[PDB]
Amino acid sequence: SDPSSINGGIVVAMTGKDCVAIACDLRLGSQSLGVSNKFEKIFHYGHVFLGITGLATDVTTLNEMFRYKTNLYKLKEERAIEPETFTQLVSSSLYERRFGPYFVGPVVAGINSKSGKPFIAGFDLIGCIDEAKDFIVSGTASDQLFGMCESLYEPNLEPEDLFETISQALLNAADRDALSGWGAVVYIIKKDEVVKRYLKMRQD
Amino acid sequence: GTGYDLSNSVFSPDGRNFQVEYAVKAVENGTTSIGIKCNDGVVFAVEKLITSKLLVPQKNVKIQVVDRHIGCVYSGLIPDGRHLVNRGREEAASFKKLYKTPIPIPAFADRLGQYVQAHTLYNSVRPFGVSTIFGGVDKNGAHLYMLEPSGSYWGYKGAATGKGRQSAKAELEKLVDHHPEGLSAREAVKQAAKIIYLAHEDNKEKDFELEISWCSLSETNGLHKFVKGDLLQEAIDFAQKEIN
Amino acid sequence: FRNNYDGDTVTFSPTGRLFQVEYALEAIKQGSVTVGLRSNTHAVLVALKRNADELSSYQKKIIKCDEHMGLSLAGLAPDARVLSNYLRQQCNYSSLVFNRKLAVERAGHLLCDKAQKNTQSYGGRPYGVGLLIIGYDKSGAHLLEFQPSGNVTELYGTAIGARSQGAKTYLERTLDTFIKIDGNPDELIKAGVEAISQSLRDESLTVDNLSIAIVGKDTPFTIYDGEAVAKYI
Amino acid sequence: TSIMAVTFKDGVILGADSRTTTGAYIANRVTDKLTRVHDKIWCCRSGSAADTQAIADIVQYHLELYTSQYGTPSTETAASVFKELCYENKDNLTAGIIVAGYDDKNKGEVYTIPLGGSVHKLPYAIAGSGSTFIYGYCDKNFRENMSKEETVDFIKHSLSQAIKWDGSSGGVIRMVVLTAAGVERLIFYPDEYEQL
Amino acid sequence: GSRRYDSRTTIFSPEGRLYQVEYALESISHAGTAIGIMASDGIVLAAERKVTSTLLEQDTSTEKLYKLNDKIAVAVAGLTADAEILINTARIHAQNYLKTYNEDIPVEILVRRLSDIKQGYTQHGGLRPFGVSFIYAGYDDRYGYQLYTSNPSGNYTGWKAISVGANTSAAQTLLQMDYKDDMKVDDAIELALKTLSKTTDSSALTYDRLEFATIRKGANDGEVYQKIFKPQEIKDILVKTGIT
Amino acid sequence: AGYDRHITIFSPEGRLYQVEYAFKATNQTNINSLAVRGKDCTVVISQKKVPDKLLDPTTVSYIFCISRTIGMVVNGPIPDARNAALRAKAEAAEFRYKYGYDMPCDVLAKRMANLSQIYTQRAYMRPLGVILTFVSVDEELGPSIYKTDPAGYYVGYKATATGPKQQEITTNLENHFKKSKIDHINEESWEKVVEFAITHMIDALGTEFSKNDLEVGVATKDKFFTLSAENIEERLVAIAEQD
Amino acid sequence: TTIVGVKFNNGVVIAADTRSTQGPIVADKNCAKLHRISPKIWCAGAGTAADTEAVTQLIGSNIELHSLYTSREPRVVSALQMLKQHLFKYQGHIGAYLIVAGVDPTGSHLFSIHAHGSTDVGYYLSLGSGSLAAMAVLESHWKQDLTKEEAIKLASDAIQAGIWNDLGSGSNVDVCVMEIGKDAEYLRNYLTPNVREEKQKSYKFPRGTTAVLKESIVNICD
């Protein structure tokens, strides 16, 4: 009935000292039925990482779409899409379907290749840009994530440290949600390199 | 090379639309007609060439009415003049629909005017082969107009076009001088019969029928109305008594 | 001269003529002769039919439009089919919406206005047919003449087609006679037969050659062919 | 809303309250419900704020275009334009409009256009939620060919009763006077009209 | 009407040739020469700009070489204006394909579609053809390295080595004389330079007049790489072969 | 070798002959016009020739009231003239409705000149054989004169003149502004600016004028209007007292 | 939201809070509800967040192209007419509630627009769920002929009424000042009366707290 509530899944992004982190759970279900423990919710286009929660067909579409749009961008501009700019392409793309929206909750994370500035952003289903310095949350357990982050978060965390904080935020939030979990993955982003870790969590 | 007269919208090197000037020739070949504006109304008249004894009298009407207060008569290609009135009739009805009030004559003129100008703008259309004399009584007094194939139109004290346009105007100009303080509606009808009969010298080989109409605040109550029976016979008898 | 001003109906000649319309008129003069004539009670059509061989049929020249109105053709047959059909709808519309028998005078104004739109627009050729329309509306008996220029004329009697000038001088001569033929259909049909043979030259009009139509006061529009016209030969 | 327009010897006068509401909250207490569509043709607006504004803006446009071409429009013409918009879009509009204008030939003229899209020409017209309460008063008081002083009083007394009884009416009483002399704007504050 | 001014761009000659296709091909034979050579371990694209000026900017310029795709690239001969319109659909088309099949478009399917767009302007619509010839250089998991050509007619063909633009007859014979199958990429690099150097209508063949590209699969990365040579790189490779 | 003169496409020399022949059309009426700026007004003067004794003099006009503020004078044949007017009026009304403020003179001009350019590029449209002169007292730029042609060109003027005998009026005015130093007519009232314009029309053309030979338009703060034969007559009595 | 607009002697000031919500949960604790239309026309937005941000941009983009076409400074009435006609067209389905103000060659202006497309004019205006809390302050302290500093104070005070008293309002106060002869000044975070108190504890986990299953390096190069 609620398209945002059929498949499940959560996403969280978090900034630190010269770093960003983006994270998601692996669950794809239909109501009570757990169907796939592999369904990843993070994607990247060059150095710009996007996460999407919501109705999974829309997640899958919007992926393909933003790959289509970034590919064409990079060919015309002869340079990779930047987080600030990408954020704007996501907003106008969603609002284009204002009165028949994609049932999604996109999240943008990355590091401006020119300025070296860490960047995260959040959206609603119709492309309202929610820009934050600390953290962004999305999905069926956003409430649990909001409480987790607001408490656990402190600014200027080191790459190693930030990993611990974001993982413990996601895990404890997913364990109070019936439709999130089943595995998990956390991207740690630096200006030069990106590190991807799978987490060990409850499988119920 | 030239060939500037082969396509409508084109300008000649002297800045003319040759196709329009060629349409004027069709009008000049047409049967003569006039309009006399008077001190409270307008009087229209026209020549009807009787080819055969087989043409029914009073039956082949040429003066058309747009709305209830306007009337139109034309020289040149009849079917074009009919088409111009169909547009006139739509245009006036559309104006009455939105603004309640019947269309003022100056407003109606510009409507036909912008429509005729439109057919001198594109190669895919032919210019109208008619001059049209039209007018009536509106919110402020009488109005009389003449519309050319180019789209040109002005207000007239007297208007004339067609085969006998020469004789008519020469007779119209004597009226404007001999009656400076306005002519009456009744007088103009009689005087319209004379003008048609005297402009029939230009074609005095074939017999003709006479067709008159008038729109006059005090005589026809401001509505366009044809001249019938006793008033018509009265106007014929005046032309006969003036031609002799 | 004429070479450059006859490519389409959109173009005027320097004299002010529309050659495409005028060539369409020529198609009528090549057509088979047909005649109309009326009194106060009845209106009549008489038409000569033209065959290809003595193995072919004589193609029909008269068409019904409604129970009080119809017409005869001279020129292109397909164009008569288009034009008669139209008047059939315009007669039909008047009936269904206004419960009204569409008057023959407005019949002509509709044909005049339809024909005119073909003479001003690019691409559209003029129609290539002339029509003799007879009716009986709320104002007695009527007969109309239609030229593909647009000019429609209410007449007592007239002819169109090949050699049709002979029939037209006859009707012009015997006006005072045929107009007073009121109450007797036969002596109006017989007046229309004597008209059309004034336009004959080569052949004698036969039983499958002649076509007669009548409308009037106590008679509706009907078609007479075959041994049903044998009495008028 | 409470609104009215009244013809008199010298011309015509329009009157209105100044309250707009969303339910029981007053959105604006100083609203001008008296709107110019032409120099000497005005209207009274009641119903939807959005609808009546959008309609009036279009009428002003149509009359402006009419003026470029045909000169000064009659009041009847201004009514016809309103009528056309209201009638033809009756399903999508909640708008009740009183059209008032001064012509130098026709003197004063008032046309009323209720929800249906019908037009009614009257010596005076009242409308708006608050008008119901003043039907009795107006019928028993109104006379033809009153003076300007007299008509301003008649409107002042009527709208004060409407404001007194109807919760959807209030603020100041705005008037607009239309005569050969020109256009006059009048305002009357609570402390004045409540005491009547 | 407009009939008079219609060139009729999509008709046959009495010979059975398409006038406009032929005249457009004549246009291309005047444009700068482009060369494509395909080797065993990669493909080479090179082109010569017509003559230009010193003032002209060479760093920002990339006028005859274009990236259609991650793995497909093109050399242009003809109007750049026309070429970009087509290059933009070609890019959109590949993306559409990727969005649908989640696989990069096979080189021929891309080529065919453009050539079908070209064929269109040849058969209907009464518009002029695109004055453009393309060389295509790409890779896919089916045929590996591919080299195609397409001209205004909508016809396309596959080649081991090819030229479009000016002096193609002279350039084709020179390739047909020095090309062999077991060629290395860096051998094909030399051939393309020598060939252009022998058909050049200018005095000397300098770096500022050249554009260069390779679609070589990395002998260490083990996946397909595109490289558009930057002025400095061309300057270096031109001294190697012995042209200074 | 022929048709590059019939539709709006380039000649070998780079010229558009249909545009050039349209300019020629603007002089068909044989009527001259001029426009000058005052302190806080703008005056258009055009010749009024009524050669036929059967015409109604009051209907013969090449001056139009486009809006409450803008007026337009046309050098060209009347049907093209009235075409251009109707559009200008529609374009003016629409601007006001859409943007909530009266259309400026220079903006209306640009628009009508952008439209004219279109007929210069598309083939099925002919250009209009008219030169349009717009006048107002713009609420931002003060007194204004802007003129458009069949080429699609437009520019702002200190003063201007148009028609067969244009150069006579032009040189006359050029010499006045070199003498006076300023770029307008230094006068308080519009009445004395209308007098100036008629005076310089007579001194440049070399012909006297009666009340029926002239047609006047005046633009003031928030108002454009045309003078009746009588207001002109009053203005002609005033000029024949100084001399 | 809470949003207000106050006219003073030489111009107009507009102000807004910075709370953004999704149901009972605060989405953004610091978003900008003030929108540049042109340099000297700014706009306060309440209602559907993406609706206000998008209609602001569409019109701002149109107003910029108009200003170039006409070579004139944009007028507040233009932006007002375009917004209302657009909103009206959508019969209120675009839920943007706007206070639009600024200066132009015709003076200083202050307006309001509702989602259904109606417009009000005034010297003091407020919209949003905090409308009533703020309007109470405006009705109590507004006088005619305000100085610039008095206008800021009043508008700032009105937004505070919403922040404290309305649950759909909070965090900071954003102000923008548009004066007749000057360049409009945008005061982002003019007041910050809701700074979060320093946490009692630190929750930095001892490294290795989280159990890892699989590790890899991601690739961006090409």
Next chain:
Amino acid sequence: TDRYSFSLTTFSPSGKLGQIDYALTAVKQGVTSLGIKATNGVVIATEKKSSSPLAMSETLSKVSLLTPDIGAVYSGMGPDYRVLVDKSRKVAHTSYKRIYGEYPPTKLLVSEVAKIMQEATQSGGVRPFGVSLLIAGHDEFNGFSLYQVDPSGSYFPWKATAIGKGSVAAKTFLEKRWNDELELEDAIHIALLTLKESVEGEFNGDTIELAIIGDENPDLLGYTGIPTDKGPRFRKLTSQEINDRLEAL
């Protein structure tokens, strides 16, 4: 109705596109304009040829702003330029700013303009545009750039060039004077001297139009508040600012 659904530019037996060749002829007949690119700025300049001593030269701008960081100048037909500028401004919003919330890079807005001109080469019932344009701009990732756009739709990047009448002699003059170490003040100095060879009449800030793409102008923005907004890089010089460099020239 539009019966012109067929091309008006077609190929002639020789391979020439007649209408384009002719459009280019019209560009040679037009008044000279030029453009020069320094290390820290770009300058575009042209001559204001006046139709009448009565016309006001201010009301006609041959140099136009397209975006805050991009300017355009031309040689050829003025009306065609004007409508191109209108479309160039619009396209920069619809196809870019309304998508990315920033302005298009110089090379991409050129590309869009080129396309608009190319369609005039091929669409039914239109002649090509009779103008060559010079576009000067800046973007964060490309630096400063100068482009030339021909009636065909083609575009070339330039260190310096001129178009129109004395373009041949002016290009020769620029080749002498241009280097890769120029400051923007120098580029203006050359521009004034290069334009002096074209102009017969009065040579001052009243008859010469000149604009630059230089540093960000904070005082031309119209508002303060956003730290990431620093003002336009396009600046048109005033009549007075031109005369200042002509007094010592």
